[PDB]
Design a protein around this ligand. Sequence first.
Ligand SMILES: [K+]
Ligand SMILES: [K+]
Ligand SMILES: [K+]
Lengths: 250, 250, 250, 250, 250, 250
Amino acid sequence: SDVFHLGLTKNDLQGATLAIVPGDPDRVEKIAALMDKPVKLASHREFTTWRAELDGKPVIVCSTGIGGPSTSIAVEELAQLGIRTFLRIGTTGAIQPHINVGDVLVTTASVRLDGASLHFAPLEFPAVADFECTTALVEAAKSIGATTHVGVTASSDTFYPGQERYDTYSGRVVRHFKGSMEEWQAMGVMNYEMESATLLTMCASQGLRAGMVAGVIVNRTQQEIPNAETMKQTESHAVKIVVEAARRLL
Amino acid sequence: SDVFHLGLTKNDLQGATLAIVPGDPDRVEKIAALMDKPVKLASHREFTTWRAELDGKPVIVCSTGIGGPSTSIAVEELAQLGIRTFLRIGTTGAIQPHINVGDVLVTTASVRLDGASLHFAPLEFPAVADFECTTALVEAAKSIGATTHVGVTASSDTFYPGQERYDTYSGRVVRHFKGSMEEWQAMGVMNYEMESATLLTMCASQGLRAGMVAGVIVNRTQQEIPNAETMKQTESHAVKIVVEAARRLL
Amino acid sequence: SDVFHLGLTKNDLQGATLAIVPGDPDRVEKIAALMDKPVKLASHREFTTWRAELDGKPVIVCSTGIGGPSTSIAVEELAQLGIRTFLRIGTTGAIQPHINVGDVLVTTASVRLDGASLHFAPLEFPAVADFECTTALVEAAKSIGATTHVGVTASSDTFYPGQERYDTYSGRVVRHFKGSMEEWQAMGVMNYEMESATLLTMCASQGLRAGMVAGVIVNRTQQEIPNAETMKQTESHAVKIVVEAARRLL
Amino acid sequence: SDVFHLGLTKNDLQGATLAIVPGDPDRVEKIAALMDKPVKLASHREFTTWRAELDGKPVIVCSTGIGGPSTSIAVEELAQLGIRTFLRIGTTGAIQPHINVGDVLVTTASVRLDGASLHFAPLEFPAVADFECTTALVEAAKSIGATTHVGVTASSDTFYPGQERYDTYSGRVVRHFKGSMEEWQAMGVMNYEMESATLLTMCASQGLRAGMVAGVIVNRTQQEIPNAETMKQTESHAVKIVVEAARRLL
Amino acid sequence: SDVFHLGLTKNDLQGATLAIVPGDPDRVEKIAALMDKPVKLASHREFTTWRAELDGKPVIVCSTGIGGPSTSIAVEELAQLGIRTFLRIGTTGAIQPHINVGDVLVTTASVRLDGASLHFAPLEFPAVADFECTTALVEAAKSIGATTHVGVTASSDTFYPGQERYDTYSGRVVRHFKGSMEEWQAMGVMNYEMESATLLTMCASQGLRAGMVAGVIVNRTQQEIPNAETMKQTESHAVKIVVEAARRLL
Amino acid sequence: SDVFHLGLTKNDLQGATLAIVPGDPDRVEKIAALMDKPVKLASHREFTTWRAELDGKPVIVCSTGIGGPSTSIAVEELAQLGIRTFLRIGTTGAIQPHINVGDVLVTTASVRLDGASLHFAPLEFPAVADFECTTALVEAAKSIGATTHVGVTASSDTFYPGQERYDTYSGRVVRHFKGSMEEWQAMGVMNYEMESATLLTMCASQGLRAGMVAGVIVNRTQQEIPNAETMKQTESHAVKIVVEAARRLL
Ligand SMILES: [K+]
Ligand SMILES: [K+]
Ligand SMILES: [K+]
């Protein structure tokens, strides 16, 4: 391999310069299957990589795992291999009452509640998305009639205390995160997830283009028993949106 | 007056909800005169306010003075009077070799080298522009033929040490800022100015829309004797862009 | 002009080494008019400058605008022109019940709730006034029988959230400033204003002498309808005190 | 499943209270096979879990993935299922000249170069190992004849800039981390890895026992072409040590 | 003297490489008297030094005074004279209900609520004890049947506000320390004292071995009138434990 | 005793409200003997206390030991016994070329390179002296003919790395303090010592008056073999000044 972790050579990419980067290794095949000539390249640790073709051009699909540290390894090693544009697709929990399950969120910039972003730029630097990527995601969402919200996301190194969850082993949250969800809500923040602060900071500070889209599967502000069906449909629409955005960025 | 500093009543605004916010009080009349039925409302301290009409709708032009503290007063008191969209117009100095004098810069987000932004949101929150305002500024720049750069700006509470200037009384820069210009250059930052970190943070955290455009009149990386005519033309260029963007946001 | 913003040459100063620096461009003429041979030198942006003569010696009066950033520009450019002593005169709101409207405050040092001070010295460095300037202000206050208080001032980059005001567009204050006024009150702090942290830090860290005096026009701790008359009288006494202090420092 | 990510019920564990936690999901089966009656329980994302029996008692082996965020999910959800002791096993790169490839490292505490540890305790709290777990790991290492070093480890949210690697896409390291490797070397730090600051802080602050052992496969201070056989043998050595330590902690 | 403060020459030590370091100059003679051939060397400021012999080998006993600053002077100057192992003995107040008066505490690492530790290593570095010293203290405690607890200690630059005491001149505690005792209690912290953060950080970052033991004389969580007798007995047992640990470290 | 550490009752003080606070317990008797009817009250740890009479009024002399932690105990327990004015006397090393051995320094405020000051007020609060105490010290210095410097002091929790000394066991200084002495020199700081940041912050934030004077016995910027007689004379000079200042503050 030409890189330390992903198990890829530059020849494997066949000249690709764009990658779609989901979190779950199990979701990579689903995304690749929407495009032409899908081929599995490698599977090592949390990093599963396929290649496919979109309008005659090679594109990469590679999983990051959960969190900024493993995300930073995938993005760096793909950059070493020639990738210059990175599109993240995820699912997410909204923290605003006006945002519904089934909706799509496009992130303009993120609240940096992570550690890895600091290894690229000091805290004062914005975790901001690329303008061309954000534009392509909004236009792709419109092309299939999705209800879309555009704005700021909170990006946390934990699933539990950093998202103010109390249903845990200890049942408590450290002082600095107590009351934090209500503060982000007042400041207009749409949602929580765990990788965008790292992704957006490391790309914007190194001349790489990045964008971020997610489907809403749950809402933290109103109690409701989730419906597995609505949730599956919502992930499928987010995947088509990221693929269509990619088409506009080739 | 209905507000503490600006010397304005809500009746004076005639229902306006958009304001163009330059820094220099002597620039307010020149911007207002490009639109219909311009009238002076007030002048107190660094805050000079005119009203005009664009495509039949009232709009405000109001100066901020230099720095985030006076900016924060103007934005708050305008919001008290009904303004919900804020467009900053300026001229600026570039720190990248590929950006030329006469070019136009549209800011997606800012590095927070200020104090007032912290009084609205903690450092981790992004100083990010509104997507609709950024889109209007970019599309207006293309409509008149400008060469445009879109990206990150460094926003400083000083003109001298925070912009790493050594041609000063002391000729010294505090440790924290020594070597800072070269760091921002490596990270792709386009330019320095002094009000956007405050403006963009206070608006993004309070449900108000803001954007920012500026004309390039000097470049810190290439020695050149300034041309007064070229600099006047560049200012006029940027002002035409901010008025046309306002037209798209009514 | 020999400087970038103020529109002054060194010859304009006629050998002056002391400046009185109020905030409001409109108040500069009032101060100059107490002295001999007053002459207007320049008006650009928030910076209005006059010259006059005190006991046969030239003195400068120059406005700063509101906030540390514009203050830092005026102080630097005046230093480039030969000024070595800076005396600030303002009006202010007290936060202690024993301090009355009509009283005069002389500041020994300031709480650094600003951004520009950090561009001169790290936070651990004290925003302390010059001992000779503080002495001259206290003695000048005694010479006209003013009721005087000497101590610490809190210096904020905002008028609204940083001074814990809730009568605003949003009606809220960021976590770190919630409860802050009561903490400063317990620690003996006399008042809030917006420029002294910057002024005192940048002078004490660069071999320049600075002092600070203000008249009390309002008290945050007891509700009362302000009297425009008492307020005008109080600003007039503070102006005579700063002029008399200057006389003792030539 | 009784937990959100791991895909496990409490019944699956058969009363287990100790878990061995490697990073790589493909290493879970190899560790479990050294013990009696090994069986696969689940595999979801980077989390692969097996059960086995040691001296008649059930034990769990569960992968964390790379970085503190995914580590924090595995540790929390295992604790929800009844686990109270956590033993980390890895391979690593040394930064001291006297430490040789083939040696074993036991960590007493870690330098916190991560984000997730802050979500459990403020920076001032020590990322310290449990004394009983450290004692068992040291005594097990001596029982099989390993050359062992006991001391402090640097635990980083990145593989590249946080470990001061320059052989990258950008070839740059942010100011804060320039010269950092030489500082840690002078302070006696043995090595870099990426999960221990999170693991040790979250356990020490919540009444859970944790320890950490690793085999040295490379040394950053001496150029050497790696030997694949030597590296495989070193991994097997460290795994035998972590199983024997578990035997002492039942 | 060969050093600035302690009044010692290297010859005075007769080849000693281990020191026992209590806080109170008055307690040095008591410790020395348990060993062979005790001799008083010097008394200057808070620094009183004796020499004695343990199993035929010279050992030093030297007081630190109260706090990290004076501790840092004693440790440095003893290191200049050849000392490489440092054992602290103290008395302390427990903050856990299960810990009783009469018990002995051995500290694995400390919460850094001091200033001097930062002059040796940044905050992220752990204030961790040496593994051989901690082992010797635990084994010495067992040899006389003491009830022993092993874990984390909070180490404060103050006796009053930093340990959340309200029975003071002012009757208040600064915001950041309000509620702090209950947070440390929840995180498993055993006790407060005032020198171990400095001692453990400066030794672990400079190749010196250090450990820490204390007798419990009071418990912050249950009201009780202290018994001078139980307190004297408890200090005597801690002194024998430190002497016996030293024997195991020669 | 009415207090925990000092071994004093309120009756012992005979109504005293002013204390002179040297660092060295062996200096307490020498200061007290310059006044009338001197008597020893107590000696415990680094705290030695005498009473004497000045112009018919009782005054206290009490040692602090080295560093802010022991200083904070002495000041708190004296305040509990009725003391409201605190005068620090010391000898010190200058860091400016124009300051000579034999000169006297009066401190207006201090750089906070300590930990204990943070336990009373956040870093942004100024470590500033009382104006009445500073005035008395300056006027007393002039009355006896001393060459006096008035200004800022750097106050450090260490004698060695925090004062950028390299003549040590390790010969290293942590990154944060490398190049620090030259920064403070450029900023006009006169000298280093180790207790004033704590003393001045705790008093200014609690309604207590404090000041500080010191005699210069060495200069870090000019190599010179110290003269023992000159150094003894300089100490006596500073002590005469602090007694005469006390006389003016009764
Ligand atoms: K201004
Ligand atoms: K991961
Ligand atoms: K001490």
